[model samples]
Target: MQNLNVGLIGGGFMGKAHSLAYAAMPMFFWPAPALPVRKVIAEANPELAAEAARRFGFENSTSDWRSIIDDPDIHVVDIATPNHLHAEIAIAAAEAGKHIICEKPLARTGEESKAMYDAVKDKNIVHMVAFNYRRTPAVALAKKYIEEGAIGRILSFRGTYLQDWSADPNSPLSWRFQKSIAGSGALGDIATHVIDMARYLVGEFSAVNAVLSTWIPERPLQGTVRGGEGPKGPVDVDDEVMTMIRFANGAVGSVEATRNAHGRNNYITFEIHGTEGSIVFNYERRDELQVAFASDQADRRGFRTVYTGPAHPYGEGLWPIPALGIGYGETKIIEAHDFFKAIAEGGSVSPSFADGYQVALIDDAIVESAAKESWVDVPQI
Candidate 1:
């Protein structure tokens, strides 16, 4: 198999996730189209970069991200940096003609995401944006069911991504709460997942009506003073957000996200309604996709759970039987496999930069809709 030497930027949460995926992708997908060699890892500091290299098993480490892009040995450039840096790294990588896989929101805004996409649109290199949830076997099963007409014509759906980490009024003002660094808070951080899923299952969004709110207007800075209250800063981003979507396919849907929601952690869920049936998925119970058929008799009219296993999509590369359960890391692995396969076969991959740009456009529409206090049409790519 060909070797796809990876040059990964960012030594944070997603940076580690990507490394884990590359390491495990080979084991799961034997005779993989290409093998991911952890060639170089870059981070904010030389020490952190060197530390990450040892932990993630990269061949080398560097504080300067540009060096990774400049390396002739690096075949794939993986961007897992914060929202603001995505465009610059991706554009540079694309210009260098390297295959690129990036963590999402694609960029801070639609226009920025567009620049990244345009850079690679006609290039021979492959570019994929990481929307790993779409690779969940049960989610894949849902897509297959929809394609086979089991769900008939789609009508509407609701997707919500909620977390409680920021519920405390005193939660420190991290980079996530600052618009300059992370763009919109929960919207770009979490709702983008919902937006991408809506596109994946439903279709293109024509318009959106949204309301973005910063529940805790201000928060303490990362470090507190010894005897008194610590410094505080304005949260220039939304702590919570909601949007109503109009799908081009005539389906209406809703997406809501909150980092300040209580009693939930990493809860991402969606339910799609169709003419003849419905499909439901809860990421917390990712192993099961619940379905209800209108054709079923009245006595059996209910949503039945299908435990994903060998019969499900990507199941051949998954665990042994039904309900073995899939973790978040496995989805990341599948995502890497797809990216690698595209590079090796010289094929296209989705949730590509093109798709990421569209999702970012939806993100822009949502933000614009909130600012104008009205529905706004999404711009076509």
Candidate 2:
């Protein structure tokens, strides 16, 4: 097997999450993707980057990410930065002939995402935008069902990603709460995931109509868990958003994401209805898939839960037991595994840059649709 070396950008929670996925892979996945080679972690702060590298077993570290591109030993660049940096870094990595893994939203705007997509298209390099939810066994199984026509002709979809992190009026203001850092708050951060799932399970979105809101204008800069709320500032992004989407397959759907929904802790759920069947899955209970097919007896027609195991699409490489749950971190591991396998085998990875760029386009259309109070077409690239 060929060797694989990865240089990572970002050292926050996501960066750590990616690092843990790399370290934990050999423990769970035997005959892991290639042989784990060098790791160079890049962060905004020199001290933080160096500390993370030392702790995470990276051979070297750098405050500047450009250094990673200059290193010929680095075969892959995994990025987990905020919304704005994706295009520039991904383009640079592609130019350097490195395989790329980028975070969602692709870039701050659709245009930037398209630019990144164009940069890497001719290179034929293995590239992916990290949409970890798509790597889940249950979700992959859902996609399989769709491909197998278990749902027959698709009719509609309802996808939502909800969290209560910003429900408090005193919740600290962060970059995610700013339009500049996260792009569109809940829409870019959370709704993009829902939109990706819709595409994965349904199809490409062609048009959109939407609405958005900012529930609380001002919030404390930090949480009380870190002592008194730090500084107070205005939240410049939306706290909630609702959208109506039309797929190229003629499936219509509703997508929503909110950070202020009470009692909901990362509740990502979607229900899809088709001519012959329907399916529902929730992130909080990701291992179970609820399905209703036409073959079921009419008197007992209802959603049935399937315990996702090796019989499922993403089940083979996971844990030992059927009921064993994989957390958010494991999702990234599966993604990493697939990405590295693609690189090793010289194959393709999706949610490719093209897919992400398209998703970004749809996101922009949704934003425009909400602003104009009408339907907008997702621009063709």
Candidate 3:
């Protein structure tokens, strides 16, 4: 069994997710390449860092992230920090000759992401962006079906990632609502996932026309779990984003994402239509895939729900029985497995830095389209 020391940055939700993934990898992924040792975690707050390290079973904690990056023992630098810090930490980690895994959207903008991509591309490092949802067994099955031509040539697609946590106007003015820190609220936080999903299932986007809005322009400044009496601040990011994308393969699609989508809590769904069939997936029902095959008799053909089991991708690795099921956290475990597997094999991983950078390019194009009120060409790098 291979072994690698992991240094994680950030003590927030994503941090916890990354930590769980690293912890669960060995248990789930057999012949697991490189079991991760929770070497150290870096957080801005010393108390939080110490608490996270202790609770997450990390060997140590430090306020300075650079220490983790520079540590000779640490072979993987996992960045789960905010958008603003992604580029800096990732570039430093790559420069330090460490393998890397940073959270989604790679960076605040495409330009920054490209720089990070450039730094790590030739370093012979296994760099991955944490698009963990792609690791969902059902999602992996979808990819398999698509590549197998079960759906023929993709024609159209639609995707949406909806959440209601920020629906209330009084939600605290956190980094998520700030343009400089979180980039673009709903677009970067949720829509980026949709963008990646589209690219994964459909094809590369050639152009996009988009619109963005900040429904809650002002929020409580100090602290408010659900809008409390406190100072107010202006939110400079989008609360919602809607776009129409044209794929290079002649497929067209629509994407909608919003934090103001009331009553929708962490709901993500996608539908891909192809010349021969169609497939649909909803994160709410993560274990099932709905498919319609054109080869079937027209009168008998309809969307059939397929429950993920040992027959599907990552399924046999997860459980011995069909429909036994895995949860959200388990997907992260699978992602960790893939990341370490890449390292052990001395290869590259899916949703790599280049893939992340491409999504960032689409994201930047969407923002530009929104600002210009016109379609913008997605840059190829």
Candidate 4:
């Protein structure tokens, strides 16, 4: 049995979430991609970096991330940084012959993402993007059903990721509110997930027509006193976004992601209408998958929710009952587990560079479609 040393950059929210899985992988995953030893964490603030290392069980901490790349001790590099920084770190890690796990929205644009993809592919190093939603058991089960012809030929797909975190004007601006640091707001932050799942369940998207909007172009600056009390400034990012997609297989799909939706919290939902049947999965209620079969009695026909059993695909690893529900955090854990397994066994990395590139392409296309107010073919560059 071999061992793998994991070095992590970025001490933000996702950095902690992914680290939890990296810390617990050996315990839950049994024989892992080697054993994930939490070796080092690099961040900007020395104090926060040290706190992160202590909280996350890392052996040490540093403010300079280049140390991770230059150190021969660290074999795998995980980039959980802002959207703008993904390419630089991932490219550097790949060039150094180290495996990498980068969080979603691989880059701000298709060209940058392509470069990152090429860097890893050219080096033939294990690489993956963290699109954890695809690892849900119910979601995996839905994909299996579609592949087995339970949904017949695909006709259309619809996906949306909505949240209300930024619906208020008083929300303080952060890197996420700045186009320079985070790229598009809702679209890049959440639509990337929708696009990834659409590809995972359907196929690669070939064309898209998108309309993006920044309802709240400005917001109050953090810790500022505007109007003698608080400061207000312009937010250079989109708040609401909608994109229509055409898959290479000719299936049409529509997607929407918005941070301005009131009272919504991480509400992701998708409906697939195929030739023979249809299926829907709600991220809010992730444990159950609804299916409407054309073969059922028309008099009593509707979507049925299956509390997936152990015999079900992906469920073979969990409980057999339909009553128990898996939480959002569990999906992240499962995704990290599968990724580590791929790295350990020298198998194919999932949500691999191609998947990330496709999502990045969609992101670029959506932004362009909105800007041009016209349909845009997903450019490979």
Model 2, 24-124: lDDT tens digits are 76555668767655479998789988888887778899999999988999998988888878888898999999999898888888888889999899996
C-alpha lDDT score of every prediction, in listed order: 0.89, 0.85, 0.88, 0.83
Report the Cα RMSD per candidate. 2.3, 3.3, 2.6, 2.5
Evaluate residue 4 in candidate 1 and report its C-alpha lDDT on the 0 to 100 scale: 81
- Candidate 3: where are CA atoms >4 Å away? 223-230
Please report the TM-score between candidate 2 and the true structure.
Answer: 0.94
User: Can you give the TM-score per candidate against the true fold?
Assistant: 0.96, 0.94, 0.96, 0.93
lDDT of predicted model 4: 0.83
Error of 3 at 201 (Å): 0.9
Estimate, for each residue in 188-274, the C-alpha lDDT of model 4 and write its tens digit: 889888888898999888999988888887777762244334467678888888988889999999999999888788888899999
The regions of model 4 sitting more than 4 angstroms off are: 31-33, 223-230
Order of quality (lDDT): 1, 3, 2, 4
The residue-by-residue lDDT of candidate 3 on 1-381, one tens digit each, is 767999999848557777888888888877688789899998888898898888888999999999888789899998888899999999999999999999877999888899999999999899999888887887888899999999899989999999999899988889899887887788988898888888888878999999998888898776234543447877999999999999998999999999987789978999999999999999989989999999999789999999988888987568888678778788889888888999999999989999999999999999999999999999877
Using TM-score as the measure, which candidate wins? 1
Error of 4 at 223 (Å): 16
lDDT of 1 by residue, 1-381 (tens): 888899999948557788899999989988887899999999889998999999899999999999988888899999888889999999989888899998888998888889999999999998998888999988999999999999899998999999999899988878899888787899998999888888888889999999998889888876224523547877889999999988898899999999987988989999999999999999988899999988899997999999998898998888999987799999999898888888888999999999999988888888999999999999878
* Candidate 1 local lDDT, residue 34: 87
Which is superior by lDDT, 1 or 4? 1
Worst 10 residues of 4 by lDDT: 222-231
